[PDB]
Symmetry: C3
Subunit: 131 residues, 3 copies
Amino acid sequence: PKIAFYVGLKSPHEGYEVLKFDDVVTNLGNHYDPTTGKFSCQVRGIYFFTYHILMRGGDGTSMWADLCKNGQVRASAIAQDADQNYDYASNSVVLHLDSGDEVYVKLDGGKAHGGNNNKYSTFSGFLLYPD
Amino acid sequence: FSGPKIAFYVGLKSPHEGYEVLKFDDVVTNLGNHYDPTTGKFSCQVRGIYFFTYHILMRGGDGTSMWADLCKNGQVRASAIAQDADQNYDYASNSVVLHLDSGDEVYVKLDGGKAHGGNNNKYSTFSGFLLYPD
Amino acid sequence: PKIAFYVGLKSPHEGYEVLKFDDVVTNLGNHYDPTTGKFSCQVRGIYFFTYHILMRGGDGTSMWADLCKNGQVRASAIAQDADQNYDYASNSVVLHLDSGDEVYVKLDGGKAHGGNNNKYSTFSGFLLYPD
């Protein structure tokens, strides 16, 4: 089986519950759902994910972009801002997934920037080894 | 992960411009010899799904913003904006998964800054590999 | 052979010789050894690695996170934020490994930050193509 996706933002989005990437560049298997913002596992196995978020949140308060699986943080990234030189929040993971597990990016204390033409905020993943 | 084996990882022997294309000349891995450091482009011979990632140490930005773009046949498919200037560098990075037809080219281009690195200090990188052939 | 790992940091660590990631999230094959901090190849082939280190200790100097194979740097990342906050140092490689080769992250000029709670600093890798 062949499962891989790469998605970005068609406009700035907030991500209080989930950052809903809506610019879908690659979606092999159709397992990423832009209406929910989640990648839902249909093949049990080992996956790679990576994200890279351009975050704005004003002030001088920290901000985070987390990768979640089923509501548990599996990687986190803290960004400052420093409204001058923004911040990107990024990380990468290898995770084991069961069928029905949900993987997504969540924002804490800041907004994600990007658009159709400037694909700044991205999220990708693919299946490494099926069980 | 079964058919042909294609993967590359490259960097800079010295600082380079890349206004049309950043020509990484430090070839660490080049399974299949499909990255060409004379053109700075990865050229697909195997139709399928590919992962790419890049991480460019940029400076020279006066005060303005600079960009590192990943292109495919002249179309930007990912961007990173870097806004340091005051002194020293800032990184511009991204990752993508793209479908390629035979003969498509993938490469990194720069706007408003210069990529830094050297065999000494492998700061600026470009890597990719085939995930699934069609 | 399914060989992949994702590891993070349970507490702040030095990494002047090797950053010993101690939060083992994924370790297919058990080839990453949290006691040494090294991933160790018994299957020769082509591997992807990526790392993302949140560092501190930059006074008026830069800091580095380097990815090494058998003592040789194969990727470097310079981090320069000092006056305030923290700064990430990150990179990705594709490398051929011989059986026995050791891959690990090494720091210079600063200290890695994190917790099992604050999962900021990460290291991941997987076998792409066995020879």
